[PDB]
Design a protein around this ligand. Sequence first.
Ligand SMILES: *[C@@H]1O[C@H](CO)[C@@H](O[C@@H]2O[C@H](CO)[C@@H](O)[C@H](O)[C@H]2NC(C)=O)[C@H](O)[C@H]1NC(C)=O
Ligand SMILES: *[C@@H]1O[C@H](CO)[C@@H](O)[C@H](O)[C@H]1NC(C)=O
Ligand SMILES: *[C@@H]1O[C@H](CO)[C@@H](O)[C@H](O)[C@H]1NC(C)=O
Ligand SMILES: *[C@@H]1O[C@H](CO)[C@@H](O)[C@H](O)[C@H]1NC(C)=O
Ligand SMILES: *[C@@H]1O[C@H](CO)[C@@H](O)[C@H](O)[C@H]1NC(C)=O
Ligand SMILES: *[C@@H]1O[C@H](CO)[C@@H](O)[C@H](O)[C@H]1NC(C)=O
Ligand SMILES: *[C@@H]1O[C@H](CO)[C@@H](O)[C@H](O)[C@H]1NC(C)=O
Lengths: 49, 88, 148, 238, 99
Amino acid sequence: NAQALNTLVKQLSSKFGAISSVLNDILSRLDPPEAEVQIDRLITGRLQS
Amino acid sequence: APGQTGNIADYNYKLPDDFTGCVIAWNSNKLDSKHSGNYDYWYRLFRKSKLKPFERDISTEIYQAGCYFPLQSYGFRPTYGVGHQPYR
Amino acid sequence: IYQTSNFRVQPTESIVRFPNVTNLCPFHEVFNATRFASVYAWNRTRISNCVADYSVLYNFAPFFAFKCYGVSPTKLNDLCFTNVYADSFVIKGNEVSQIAPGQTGNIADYNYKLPDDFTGCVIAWNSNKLDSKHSGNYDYWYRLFRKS
Amino acid sequence: TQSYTNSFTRGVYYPDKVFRSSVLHLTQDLFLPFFSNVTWFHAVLPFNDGVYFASTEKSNIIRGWIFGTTLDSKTQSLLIVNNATNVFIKVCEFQFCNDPFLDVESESGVYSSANNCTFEYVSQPFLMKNLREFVFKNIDGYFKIYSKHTPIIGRDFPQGFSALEPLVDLPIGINITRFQTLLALTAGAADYYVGYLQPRTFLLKYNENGTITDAVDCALDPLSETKCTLKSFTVEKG
Amino acid sequence: VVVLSFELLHAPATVCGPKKSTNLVKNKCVNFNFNGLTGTGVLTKSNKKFLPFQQFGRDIVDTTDAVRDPQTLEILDITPCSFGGVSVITPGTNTSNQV
Ligand SMILES: *[C@@H]1O[C@H](CO)[C@@H](O[C@@H]2O[C@H](CO)[C@@H](O)[C@H](O)[C@H]2NC(C)=O)[C@H](O)[C@H]1NC(C)=O
Ligand SMILES: *[C@@H]1O[C@H](CO)[C@@H](O)[C@H](O)[C@H]1NC(C)=O
Ligand SMILES: *[C@@H]1O[C@H](CO)[C@@H](O)[C@H](O)[C@H]1NC(C)=O
Ligand SMILES: *[C@@H]1O[C@H](CO)[C@@H](O)[C@H](O)[C@H]1NC(C)=O
Ligand SMILES: *[C@@H]1O[C@H](CO)[C@@H](O)[C@H](O)[C@H]1NC(C)=O
Ligand SMILES: *[C@@H]1O[C@H](CO)[C@@H](O)[C@H](O)[C@H]1NC(C)=O
Ligand SMILES: *[C@@H]1O[C@H](CO)[C@@H](O)[C@H](O)[C@H]1NC(C)=O
């Protein structure tokens, strides 16, 4: 039960195919429609975890 | 176009990101351009800041630095294409 | 017993910390300097890394012209372009329709040619009082004719 | 003399600027593999992807570097010198094509056609029974240099562990391919080594005070590979 | 007349504009931006030792838990602001309405 929680938390620092792994970091330095598809990759990856 | 920002992209005509219509170009350079400049009607170059989508402002010359009207002429030509097209 | 939602403690304010502001740009060198090079032999003013505060620019010798062809005056201090290409010279006031993309004429194809794809700020003001004293500097030369 | 010697367990530097305590972090970057060949020069070389200088003597061994591409003409070369008061990390090039002088008094005898100098960075002098090490890694126009100031106790390689700390990083933006060494700080000897860098995976160990104290090469022998998989320094029977 | 051209190149930018700063607060849930690092939490005085080249600390699960103030070199701790679930205890609504 300890390993599963540690693995779950460490999945928050994975790019999953986007520019970065921080929500507001890509929110600022990116085009608002361009940033829409980047958030999609992070959401789909974190749902699968 | 939705999203992209800079100069008149959001200073005057802020197109919402949820746009659904279709953009059409009508170029008749000879008809809607004077030989020395369409000074009759002017564009707001340097206003205060941006504005929310579908917002119209008509007050002018009230703002001044802390410059007058920011209408920096047209200088159009009926034959010039780059920088002078009417592009309605 | 049912579970409905979650509770959170909202932040009360916002805070920002950044290092000491040092290494001001060479813009102070042109300050307290009421003379520089000519228009054809324009003085090079390449700028290395430094803090790009520009408020002092608007204070010393209030500029008649403040418009920026490439950028906006509001979007002035936010930018962090790689370097600076600053060119300065002395021009006639009646030649106002000569420093811009286009309007090729006496100063364009004979003296230094202003690039059409300008991406900076156009600053101009009448500095006759600060420069042209009673004696005058009529010995200064500028091209009115050429062959290239 | 182009002799060779075992590199042992040397060439570990701090990979980033992150504090850690009592953790075993498994990184993946450029490193010098354990037990490799070292060309023990005594009396011109490709840059590859980094070097490991180890010139020690006792007090005075090395006093210059070049780190250029063409080493002549007007191509930018990141000339690096040092003395008792300051270093000169400057983008300014001579013509070279000659052996610099080995005086024990000024820059004469090394420079011939000193042209424009673009960058003129100056900082604390490099110098702090002395061992001096170096790593010259460049990526995305970032010249990163590391250092260490352990005293020399053995005339051979002082077997042990060391961790190079960052010294300075510069946004140069140029690419280099060759380099030269300047020495003598007159019959004598000048001990001097050099290695090379390869991509590798390492398992570093941090104590609770944030100082690297050990490492394991993950592609050396079957035992070392097992430790990286388990992320531990002890393997039980199995 | 002076014209300054804002050229740019793939090499790292050199001339950035002026940067501002604010005060510092402790034991209060507040948003922070420490030299380009963003986050929220409560900042308190730390008791850890930093080598004089590192900036911030990370825990085992790679989450920031310590920072260094760029104005004055001092180490600060970061703790997230409190959160949790909420439950409602009720009897039969056919009987009463208290909760
Ligand atoms: C020193 O100044 C010279 C010019 O006097 C620089 O040479 C120019 O460098 C720029 C950018 O590096 C090039 O775009 C030009 O084509 C170069 N011109 C010539 C004639 O070489 C030089 O880069 C400066 N710095 C050094 C270290 O020499
Ligand atoms: C930055 O300014 C503050 C002002 O009080 C000063 O205390 C501090 O020492 C300065 N930073 C450095 C690195 O000296
Ligand atoms: C700055 O300008 C004033 C103008 O009167 C002058 O007195 C002073 O010496 C100048 N300072 C310099 C050039 O450092
Ligand atoms: C050009 O600028 C430099 C740097 O400020 C200055 O030393 C030099 O006197 C200037 N030349 C002229 C002709 O103004
Ligand atoms: C180091 O020596 C040579 C390098 O010339 C190399 O071929 C060899 O494998 C290395 N190891 C030993 C033990 O010689
Ligand atoms: C080291 O070199 C610098 C070069 O600027 C020189 O000024 C200094 O005197 C030198 N050190 C000694 C001890 O001479
Ligand atoms: C870490 O630092 C503390 C305080 O300086 C010291 O007591 C302790 O021994 C250090 N740990 C080491 C050196 O492993």
